[PDB]
Design an enzyme around this catalytic site. Structure first.
Site, PDB file in Angstrom:
ATOM      1  N   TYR A  17      -8.000  -0.729   3.270  1.00  0.00           N
ATOM      2  CA  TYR A  17      -9.020   0.231   2.896  1.00  0.00           C
ATOM      3  C   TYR A  17     -10.425  -0.301   3.112  1.00  0.00           C
ATOM      4  O   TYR A  17     -11.232  -0.336   2.184  1.00  0.00           O
ATOM      5  CB  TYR A  17      -8.803   0.637   1.419  1.00  0.00           C
ATOM      6  CG  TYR A  17      -7.641   1.614   1.353  1.00  0.00           C
ATOM      7  CD1 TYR A  17      -6.329   1.177   1.294  1.00  0.00           C
ATOM      8  CD2 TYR A  17      -7.891   2.979   1.365  1.00  0.00           C
ATOM      9  CE1 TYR A  17      -5.279   2.075   1.237  1.00  0.00           C
ATOM     10  CE2 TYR A  17      -6.850   3.882   1.310  1.00  0.00           C
ATOM     11  CZ  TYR A  17      -5.550   3.427   1.248  1.00  0.00           C
ATOM     12  OH  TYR A  17      -4.525   4.345   1.196  1.00  0.00           O
ATOM     13  N   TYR A 144       0.607   7.021  -7.376  1.00  0.00           N
ATOM     14  CA  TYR A 144       0.447   6.407  -6.067  1.00  0.00           C
ATOM     15  C   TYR A 144       1.817   6.043  -5.497  1.00  0.00           C
ATOM     16  O   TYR A 144       2.621   5.406  -6.184  1.00  0.00           O
ATOM     17  CB  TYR A 144      -0.426   5.151  -6.113  1.00  0.00           C
ATOM     18  CG  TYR A 144      -0.525   4.488  -4.750  1.00  0.00           C
ATOM     19  CD1 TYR A 144       0.054   3.254  -4.505  1.00  0.00           C
ATOM     20  CD2 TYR A 144      -1.203   5.123  -3.713  1.00  0.00           C
ATOM     21  CE1 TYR A 144      -0.044   2.662  -3.259  1.00  0.00           C
ATOM     22  CE2 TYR A 144      -1.304   4.542  -2.468  1.00  0.00           C
ATOM     23  CZ  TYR A 144      -0.722   3.312  -2.249  1.00  0.00           C
ATOM     24  OH  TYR A 144      -0.816   2.725  -1.007  1.00  0.00           O
ATOM     25  N   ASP A 245       9.885   5.933  -8.525  1.00  0.00           N
ATOM     26  CA  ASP A 245       9.263   4.904  -7.683  1.00  0.00           C
ATOM     27  C   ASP A 245       9.083   3.651  -8.528  1.00  0.00           C
ATOM     28  O   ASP A 245       8.151   3.571  -9.321  1.00  0.00           O
ATOM     29  CB  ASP A 245       7.937   5.375  -7.112  1.00  0.00           C
ATOM     30  CG  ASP A 245       7.337   4.508  -6.031  1.00  0.00           C
ATOM     31  OD1 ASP A 245       6.424   4.990  -5.321  1.00  0.00           O
ATOM     32  OD2 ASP A 245       7.742   3.341  -5.867  1.00  0.00           O
ATOM     33  N   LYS A 274       8.300  -4.436  -2.752  1.00  0.00           N
ATOM     34  CA  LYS A 274       7.373  -5.452  -3.209  1.00  0.00           C
ATOM     35  C   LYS A 274       8.058  -6.646  -3.855  1.00  0.00           C
ATOM     36  O   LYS A 274       8.450  -7.593  -3.176  1.00  0.00           O
ATOM     37  CB  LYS A 274       6.380  -4.837  -4.199  1.00  0.00           C
ATOM     38  CG  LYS A 274       5.380  -3.882  -3.560  1.00  0.00           C
ATOM     39  CD  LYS A 274       4.024  -4.014  -4.244  1.00  0.00           C
ATOM     40  CE  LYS A 274       3.028  -2.985  -3.736  1.00  0.00           C
ATOM     41  NZ  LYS A 274       3.523  -1.600  -3.940  1.00  0.00           N
TER      42      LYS A 274
HETATM   43  C1  PLP Z   1       2.683  -0.606  -3.658  1.00  0.00           C
HETATM   44  C2  PLP Z   1       3.357   0.724  -3.926  1.00  0.00           C
HETATM   45  C3  PLP Z   1       3.729   1.517  -2.887  1.00  0.00           C
HETATM   46  C4  PLP Z   1       3.481   1.102  -1.467  1.00  0.00           C
HETATM   47  O1  PLP Z   1       4.217   0.236  -0.609  1.00  0.00           O
HETATM   48  P1  PLP Z   1       3.663  -0.332   0.688  1.00  0.00           P
HETATM   49  O2  PLP Z   1       4.391  -1.656   0.955  1.00  0.00           O
HETATM   50  O3  PLP Z   1       2.185  -0.635   0.475  1.00  0.00           O
HETATM   51  O4  PLP Z   1       3.841   0.615   1.817  1.00  0.00           O
HETATM   52  C5  PLP Z   1       4.356   2.728  -3.128  1.00  0.00           C
HETATM   53  N1  PLP Z   1       4.552   3.038  -4.405  1.00  0.00           N
HETATM   54  C6  PLP Z   1       4.203   2.289  -5.483  1.00  0.00           C
HETATM   55  C7  PLP Z   1       4.475   2.737  -6.888  1.00  0.00           C
HETATM   56  C8  PLP Z   1       3.575   1.073  -5.259  1.00  0.00           C
HETATM   57  O5  PLP Z   1       3.166   0.228  -6.330  1.00  0.00           O
END
Ligand code: PLP
Ligand code: PLP
Ligand code: NA
Ligand code: NA
Ligand code: NA
Ligand code: NA
EC number: 2.6.1.62
Lengths: 429, 429
Positions: A17, A144, A245, A274
């Protein structure tokens, strides 16, 4: 790294960004060990960010390193279509065991965004094979889920610049953001913007998708698990699918292995990433039930229509197995319980700071929100100088350190934060 | 790999584009070196697929491995936002130098699909910054650009099941598939649908996006360079942006380092991937010109609105540098030109085979299209039996091996293919 190296970076290399015309400085990191990052000038910062949730074991963990080098010696990559291999199996083996019972079908992918596109796509293919016309997604504000187009469509419209994509971006439904706070009072009146949204599109919703308990990049908020209990039930009765998520919250970052455990519910679809591979490289995981798995596969296409080139990357899977292996030990449970206490404890003075709106902590997550946006370069410069790495954003200064952080290390972090929020020096407007 | 391991896979682990109720057989690979893949039973297959383009240096390359292990020893990963490091900088240093001059701003991402989602977002953000209303994309039919929503939007509507996503997916402009073939007669009628598509949408199109010269997973077709030159002018005279997807053609697969070289043209935006890291792990790259890069940063957003969690992954960045280092030797040109020779020669018998529609070769890309869909399970089983790994698709049997492949090795691939298209046995009428 040299003077000309750093000049090449600013002029040609994009960062997350970031502006090409006016970028703000970056710090040259040559290596990293334990809970520290090493700048080319030899300085050692204590890591406060876990490289953004991911590096829960710190850096240059020996277990991680050995698993990585051994897999490279067998093969760090081989195509998955349609070949299989021991790392992949043992990774999906662990994933299924550690998650709620109904989640046993696994789609490995390369990033958090890709995996969120996969859940999303699973939901549409599920309803298209069922003869139902359900193309809508329902999500909380401040959510997000990624930067790819599909996931962009489930992100906070304002936080993100959806005006930018006014026209291209498909229009979804956003209920108000969860007001009642994690470990706080449940206010019935919280469930109305949602109640009416489901009411008027109940026929239309293919799925509800939210971040469980912790809303990450949308403002580090921590809402009441009562919210998820209410969410599981409506989906259940409505038949519409629930996407969790846990890409940010996953693997006990919030004091529980998965964040949905805070309400003892299980989603219809779970996205992970992650922290999955202990912050070593990119890998993603989307799990679902066998019934979705089959209702999608018995449909028009004959298959779930996704499959990226590097699906099931043995190297990544190896890092992943090494990481889950560290967790299985269970030692993380007290590491986080301990970090939580010291976070809640040492961040407490902060609420008396004139520049502080709120201080909230859950698990190994400490959030200190200000009433004005930080002066990024200024603050960012002040943290380094303190020997700590802390990446602040907008009105948030927050910690999310390696589980392995030593108390004295946490202490410096927590001391830099307090120090930094008591003067109007590093803030604007 | 053990009996229940293989059974666990079939029931729980998804593969690229696969059914969970009735999946087809898969083969367990335990390791791989040079141009061969080894099965759990000790069986040794010559790889003709390069794990889908990427593994241009074969497997277990010694340069590849040691760079990976060395970076692993400094750090496999650290966040890039906003920190910098040696692996990233040097990668973009090579990237900028090796591509056409105007391309000098690099955005690192995790996969091809994501790189394409970046290219598209750059294009839309570009036109938002100039006050122009251009949200539409122009692209060829038979193209493939990824599996994510935005990239899905510019994949062949039929090849891909665009009915499945009727509505959600943005509806873009599709010119007919490029009729004139690589090395053939340029026929002016070729440029009528396209001209007329631009003619009525001259005003709306934010960008044109196509695979340069080779149309990948959407057909293994090979068009005439004249299409690229003509496209550069229309883009230029209209001002519209041109995106070339070289995630599949990049790094000399077609006889030139980048496939736009065949037409001596440069894109405004370039997508890269797969072979970027020698097929060791996933990494992506989107380069653009300084006018695009600045026009976006000086727009409403104040930055290009993208930044994946693992952006600039030091480990991957390390692998890529070694792979590009290997190319710098320059051996690839005559290695590829030679593989081109062999495919032309030994794939020649195929045109007398009843089951073959077409036989085309470009670089180390050998294509044999059949008259009917292959019998995937059956065909797939026969190749293994042949000592080769060839992964057929739809009506195509094609070969795309590592540049290192031995004349004796290639021979077997091409001989397995020839055998396989004589009878009607491995096909499904
Ligand atoms: C970091 C994150 C993402 C994004 O994954 P990327 O590896 O950046 O594409 C999607 N959802 C949540 C809740 C996140 O914390
Ligand atoms: C392979 C490919 C992609 C996809 O990249 P993924 O890593 O599979 O998401 C996109 N475009 C082209 C031209 C490709 O060959
Ligand atoms: Na499970
Ligand atoms: Na099926
Ligand atoms: Na360049
Ligand atoms: Na700017």
């Amino acid at each position: 790294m040299t003077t000309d190296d750093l000049a090449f970076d600013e002029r040609h290399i994009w960062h997350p960004y970031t502006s090409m015309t006016s970028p703000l400085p970056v710090y040259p990191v040559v290596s990293a060990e334990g809970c520290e990052l090493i700048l080319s000038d030899g300085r050692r910062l204590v890591d406060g960010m876990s490289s953004w949730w991911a590096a829960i074991h710190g850096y240059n963990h020996p277990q991680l390193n050995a698993a990585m080098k051994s897999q490279i010696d067998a093969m760090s990559h081989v195509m998955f279509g349609e070949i299989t291999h021991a790392p992949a199996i043992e990774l999906c083996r662990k994933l299924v065991a550690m998650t709620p019972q109904p989640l046993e079908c696994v789609f490995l992918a390369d990033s958090g965004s890709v995996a969120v596109e996969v859940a999303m796509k699973m939901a549409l293919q599920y309803w298209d094979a069922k003869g139902e016309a359900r193309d809508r997604f329902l999500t909380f504000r401040n959510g997000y889920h990624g930067d790819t187009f599909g996931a962009m469509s489930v992100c906070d419209p304002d936080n993100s610049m959806h005006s930018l994509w006014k026209g291209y971006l498909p229009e979804n439904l956003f209920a108000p953001a969860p007001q009642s706070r994690m470990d706080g009072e449940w206010d019935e009146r919280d469930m109305v913007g949602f109640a009416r949204l489901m009411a008027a599109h109940r026929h239309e919703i293919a799925a509800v998708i939210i971040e469980p308990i912790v809303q990450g990049a949308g403002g580090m908020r921590m809402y009441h698990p009562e919210w998820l209990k209410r969410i599981r039930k409506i989906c259940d009765r409505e038949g519409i699918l629930l996407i969790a998520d846990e890409i940010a919250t996953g693997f006990g970052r919030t004091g529980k292995l998965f964040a949905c455990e805070h309400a003892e519910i299980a989603p219809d679809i779970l996205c992970l990433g992650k922290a999955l591979t202990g912050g070593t490289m990119t890998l993603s995981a989307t799990l679902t039930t066998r019934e979705v798995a089959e209702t999608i596969s018995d449909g028009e296409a004959g298959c779930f229509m996704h499959g990226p080139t590097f699906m099931g990357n043995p190297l990544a899977c190896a890092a992943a197995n090494a990481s889950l292996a560290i967790l299985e030990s269970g030692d993380w449970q007290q590491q986080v319980a301990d970090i939580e206490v010291q976070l809640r404890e040492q961040l407490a003075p902060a609420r008396d700071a004139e520049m502080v709106a709120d201080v909230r902590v859950l698990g190994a997550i400490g959030v200190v929100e200000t009433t004005h946006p930080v002066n990024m370069a200024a603050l960012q410069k002040f943290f380094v100088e303190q020997g700590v790495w802390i990446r602040p954003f907008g009105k948030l200064i927050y910690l999310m350190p390696p589980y392995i952080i030593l108390p004295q290390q946490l202490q410096r972090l927590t001391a830099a934060v307090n120090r930094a929020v008591q003067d109007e020096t590093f803030f604007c407007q």
